[PDB]
Design a protein around this ligand. Structure first.
Ligand SMILES: OC[C@H]1O[C@@H](O[C@H]2[C@H](O)[C@@H](O)[C@@H](O)O[C@@H]2CO)[C@H](O)[C@@H](O)[C@@H]1O
Ligand SMILES: OC[C@H]1O[C@@H](O)[C@H](O)[C@@H](O)[C@@H]1O
Length: 257
């Protein structure tokens, strides 16, 4: 059992999987009130009731991303012990991720439930820059739109609550300090169970970036981590009340030459 009540990172092991939990309030300059994240051996929960919020950089828009992850998160130069990641995108035959989730929030709060990875040129960078990519997969959103511009839609399968469905995913692309690609499910789900293969998203991002002038040799990039969390806030938001619970977590990364 692990508990955190202030920003920071803690490692844990869940169902034999080495993971990292991060009570991530990366773009908040100051806050008052309470935040708590806990892992009890069977579930990870997060609860926030914070006020007196101000951002560090208004330009970034969101305020934080409480989350847990498998692998090496570049920004925090951090990995738990025993992860197979990072590996070259080309080394990933399949990467199945499964998790149950229940997200709740005050109605007007901009928020999402999104997963993400950082594809980088070198294996252990401490930042992302031109030539690198951030790929996100949004299963839910409230009062929040991905950054960049919507450039297309893809039909990508996934198992929703036990049933194979064909989801419709909007691809938003932003060319910032690195490339940002966000795939947003058009039928957002606030609570449920999902199982999917990250390889499908990597294949779709690879095609969308095939003609890029900033990103080259996509398959040679290092898939560093797989983050699961909830971004929240906006430059104007002065308070936030929300929380979540994730359970039934398993992942399977299949490595090939
Ligand atoms: O910019 C460095 C911080 O990035 C945070 O991840 C953001 C990312 O920057 C956004 O482009 C988008 O992908 O959402 C992510 C989560 O809000 C990262 O979590 C921080 O640790 C970094 O300092
Ligand atoms: O930091 C930039 C932010 O831009 C927003 O428009 C997106 O909704 C977030 O996914 C992203 O984190």
């Amino acid at each position: 059992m692990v508990l955190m009540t202030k920003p920071g990172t803690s490692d844990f092991v869940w169902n034999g999987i080495p993971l990292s939990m991060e009570l991530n309030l990366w773009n908040i300059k100051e806050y008052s009130g309470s935040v708590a994240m806990k892992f009890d051996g069977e579930k990870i929960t997060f609860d926030a009731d914070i006020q007196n919020l101000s951002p560090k950089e208004p330009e970034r828009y969101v305020l934080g991303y409480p989350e847990f992850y498998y692998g090496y998160k570049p920004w925090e130069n951090h990995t738990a012990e025993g992860s197979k990641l990072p590996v070259p995108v080309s080394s990933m035959k399949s990467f199945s991720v499964e998790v149950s989730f229940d997200i709740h929030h005050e109605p007007s709060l901009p928020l999402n439930f999104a997963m993400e990875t950082w594809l980088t040129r070198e294996k252990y960078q401490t930042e992302a820059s031109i030539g690198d990519v951030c790929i996100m997969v949004w299963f839910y959103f409230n009062n929040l739109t991905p950054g960049g511009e919507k450039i297309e839609e893809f039909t990508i399968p996934f198992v929703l609550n036990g049933e194979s469905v064909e989801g419709t995913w909007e691809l938003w692309l932003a060319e910032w300090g690195w490339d940002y690609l966000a795939f947003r499910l058009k039928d957002p789900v606030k609570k449920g169970r999902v199982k999917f293969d990250v390889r499908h998203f990597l294949d779709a991002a690879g095609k969308a970036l095939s003609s890029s002038a900033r990103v080259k040799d996509f398959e040679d990039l290092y898939f560093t981590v797989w983050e699961i969390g909830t971004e929240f806030g906006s430059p104007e938001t002065k308070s936030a009340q929300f929380g979540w619970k994730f359970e039934n977590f398993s992942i399977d990364l299949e490595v090939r030459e």
